Design a protein around this nucleic acid. Structure first.
Lengths: 63, 145
RNA sequence: GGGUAGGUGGUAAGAACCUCAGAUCCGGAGAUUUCCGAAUGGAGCAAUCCGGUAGUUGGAAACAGCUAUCAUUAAUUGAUGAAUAAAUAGUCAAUUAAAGCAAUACGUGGUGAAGUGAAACAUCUCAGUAGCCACAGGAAAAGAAAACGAAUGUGAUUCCGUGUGUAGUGGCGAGCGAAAGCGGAACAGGCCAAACUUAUCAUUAGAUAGGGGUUGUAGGGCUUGCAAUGUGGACUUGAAAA
RNA sequence: CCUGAGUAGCUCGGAAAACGUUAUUUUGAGUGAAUCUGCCCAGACCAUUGGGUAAGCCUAAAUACUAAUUAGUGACCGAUA
RNA sequence: GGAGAUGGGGAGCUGUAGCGAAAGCGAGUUUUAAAAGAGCGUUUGUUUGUUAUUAUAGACCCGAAACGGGUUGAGCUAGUCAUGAGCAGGUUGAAGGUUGAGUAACAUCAACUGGAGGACCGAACCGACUCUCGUUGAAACGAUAGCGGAUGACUUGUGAUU
RNA sequence: UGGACCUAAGCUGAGGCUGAAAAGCGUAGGCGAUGGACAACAGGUUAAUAUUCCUGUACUUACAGUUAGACUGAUGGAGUG
RNA sequence: GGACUGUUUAACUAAAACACAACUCUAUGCCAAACCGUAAGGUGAUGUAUAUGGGGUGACACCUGCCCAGUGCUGGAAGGUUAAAGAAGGAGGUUAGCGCAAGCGAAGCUUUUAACUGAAGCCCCAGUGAACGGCGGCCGUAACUAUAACGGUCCUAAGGU
RNA sequence: AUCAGGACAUUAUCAUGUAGAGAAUAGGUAGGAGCAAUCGAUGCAAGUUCGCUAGGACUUGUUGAUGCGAAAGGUGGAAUACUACCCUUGGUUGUGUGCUGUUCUAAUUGGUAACUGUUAUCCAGUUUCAAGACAGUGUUAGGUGGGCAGUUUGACUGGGG
RNA sequence: AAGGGUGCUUGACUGUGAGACAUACAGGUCGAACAGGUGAGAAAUCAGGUCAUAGUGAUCCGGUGGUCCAGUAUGGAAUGG
RNA sequence: GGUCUUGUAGCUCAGUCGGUAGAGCAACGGUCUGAAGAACCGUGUGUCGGCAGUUCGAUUCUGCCCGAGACCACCA
């Protein structure tokens, strides 16, 4: 499971090339960022989060 | 990143405003010394609320900072050197001030008391700034064994 | 409850029994139901070994007999707690749901190729197929208008038949292939949030609890006014009747 | 005064739609507004007109199938079936 | 509807005029300046059943070497970790040290103890180098005869793992 | 001979870590002899077993009252094996 | 011929084969370098250049001659080639309107690839042969001459000691 | 966050320049036949640049109101000043565009160490030790890349090649 | 003469072509003649490339010019015919 | 197809922007020297790939062609 806990976004399996007549498959690994979390009680250190989720946290001022 | 700061002009822009400029990640929001609160109120009243809260919070910070220098200057800080042949090994770092603070119980942060990383023997004195309206002094003494 | 003059499950001969006071047999409600096995006190080679607690009986005791209990996760409750006062992870106790299996069939989602034809083949095809996984229910998924689509036109979603093998699409091959339109099966649309209003939270509440409110021909909020006890279940009880 | 924002978009890859990526639906990275006064749509995209308010929730039918229980049928097979 | 014929049920479907790329027209259409010539036209049924062919479906039928996915396997074999055990018997004498001779002392020499080998001879044990035998056998890998190694890159008892 | 003892690589595995799912890895724990520790030999007899069945000679580790001596001492540290 | 002890197709080939001592080069200063694995995780390793794996050869002794033309390598920058992207600027269209026709045309948007920058590699150069790989012909010349030390030329980077 | 240094734009900056004849270093194009003239000329001094050792330019001193012999006469294929222009090289600051080297810590990374949980080498945290916005990692787009996948590799023919 | 040379212009035209050649098809070949404007030459007529038999490359796909054609609701535009 | 570069003598190297065709070797003559040497001065080899413009006047400038070395071509 390469994803954060607060949001559930699964890595999509797709394709890859810039040139060919055939087809292949690869995944997209969602970018994961270890950042401190914010809450009034206890645990506030490293948790993995998604980048878009981080940006939403920044504009929503979730500290 | 952030659009609000906790303080007015200190060394650069990004005052205690509804909207502030930003250039990448900063301690302008990370540090508890200077943070930002969620907006969650911004239609027209938010700027007046932030301004009034700015003056009131500056005044209350000044009052509590005076009390905190008084209470921390009254107290005494003593430790012990576990030494061999009169050679100092004890660590004198922010640990000690955090310990003495948690015995007393005031809210601080470990990057807020910036203290030099070194050793010390005998009585010595330290001058440090706690906030941007503060200038304080603290004393450390140690006993040999 | 019904019904009966024998039966003692199949290889049937003998035993030895009860039975005409109702068995045998049929159905309903049941009690109990060894071990292992999701198997869960712990372990292990499934039909094995060691247990712990609380009782209870015997015996000085040891130990032996009959009961329940003692696994994990998640959520909730209480105690609990290090750096570091608090808090914090964690620790134990209590309550509640699993976790399995199968109807080899149907549901969704995620995974996911080949030989196959193309007279080769790497395109397309074989198909999201096989197979795998996870979660399901008697079914599920789907589903109430940024729907349509061109009109003086309809008005949740699904399936059936015409449209049609069409318009298109494509190493423009092999092929793939509609969506509207029309005709039927059924047809119920309701419910939050958001404006505002009542209390707590250090009224920095941004959270909770309650009232109003559930959208196109715009609606709701706002100061009011007029009229009304209505019909509906998608549903709670008991009662009756079939 | 309110009617659902990292949202519609857009760029880069992508995927389902007849589609073999094109308006239409989804998004992995990046970036990024408006508020019924507008937004989108009528397969590029403007103007006029129309259509209705997505970025909330649930919703029985209209169905596929017979492992079962009972009854029954078979221009069903009769022991190499 | 006795899991039947049928009755209902025009939604469509072939024809009723065709041309062309279509616009658009039309007993004409396209070319063009053209009506000329050339192009197809100048009404020539449909619903069934039965045969014949055919379209795709395992499609007159049995035949592969394969391919991909999913399972099973270290009791064979190869490798390794642990735990063990055995290897008849007999040869061989490297050092080292000690004694004595020797020398100025060494060097050197005569020796004694002593035991070193991917040592040797060679049983059990391993292997299978060689000829014969059988080779639709006693036996899906041997039998007789020989042979090499056989205190070490030896073997195998068991467990385990790949 | 083996359990009621522990371990040899190895296995499993509360938490935990990683990974589409499956699953893999791994802490503390727990299993795993062919290892390590523990007290019985001679003989007799059935057609069938026998150190076990029977005669002899013993030992052993625990519980219980008891007498005499005595303060002992573990999951803790060290030797031992 | 190989040093040898020793190893290999159970079941048709045991050796010129394998293998070792030993020799040589090379990537690496530790979380290594090599990897096994989709990532954690693990060996090399509770390792630390006398370490470590890989490429070649294979007692002992002696030699290792030429050629960086090209290939693969090391280092460098003079210059040119250079995607992706960042964004000078231009063009197309609608049309509020100006407008007699035309045409022009503010407004938002669509289509547009650009000016310039833009990595490494490549072309380039210096080195590199117990790393790939190759190691030529011709002509005459010394008192018989066949002989060619000795000298000359075409090719190539080079002509077998 | 942080300072500094080097490139491309160009304001504004001045210099910029030999065939022969040309009194001639001459980059040329065309109006101008002018103006420097207390701000003052032919001509001389010290300094800067320079390139022809010879061309050209500027500050101060000096000549004193004139001449520039390159305004016009006069010469040269290409005429003199100025006027606007296209070339120039170098430097000077004006900032825009991205580049490199800085410092810090504060994101992030730890297979540093210690402590508690925990009888425990995994982990949770705190600190330390470090690095340090490098860099893991994600995405996009290049390179390299038989380690690997899919396959490919016509025919005729007195057999085929 | 279909050879040579001179002069004149440029039909190496357009829309077409019954009728034939041979013909797996595609494909290839010869042209009667009509209508329009033509040049040569008074006319006659000729002139629908070279005296011929060789001198070639299928379609999609893409581009260019015109385009009385269409243009997804409309007008345009895109885009295609 | 663009984007850059390259062309000279009998062979191998040059090349003041327009203001010109130059070393070495290939062949010969000569000079130095007791002699042979040896070395060197040099007759010569030059429309500077070609074609049209520029400039008083072109081998290098402009445009074209010829001989050539390099980076670029595919729908899921």
């Amino acid at each position: 499971a390469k994803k954060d806990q607060l949001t559930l976004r699964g890595p999509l399996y797709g394709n890859n090339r810039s040139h060919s007549k055939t087809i292949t498959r690869r995944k997209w690994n969602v970018n994961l960022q270890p950042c401190k979390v914010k809450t009034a009680d206890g645990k506030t250190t490293r948790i993995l989060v998604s980048t878009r989720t981080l940006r939403t946290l920044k504009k929503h001022n979730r500290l | 990143m952030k659009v609000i700061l906790k303080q007015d002009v200190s060394n650069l822009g990004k005052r205690f405003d509804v909207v502030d400029v930003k250039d990448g990640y900063a301690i302008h929001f990370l540090f508890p010394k200077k943070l930002a609160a969620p907006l969650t109120k911004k239609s027209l009243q938010d700027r007046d609320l932030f301004l009034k809260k700015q003056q009131e919070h500056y005044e209350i910070n000044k009052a509590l900072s005076h009390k905190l220098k008084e209470v921390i200057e009254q107290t005494e800080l003593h430790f012990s050197l576990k030494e061999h042949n009169g050679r100092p090994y004890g660590s004198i770092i922010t640990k000690q001030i955090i310990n003495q603070a948690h015995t007393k119980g005031m809210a601080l942060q470990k990057f807020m008391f910036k203290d030099n990383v070194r050793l010390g023997f005998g009585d010595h004195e330290i001058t440090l700034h706690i906030f941007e309206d503060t200038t304080a002094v603290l004393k450390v003494k140690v006993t040999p064994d």
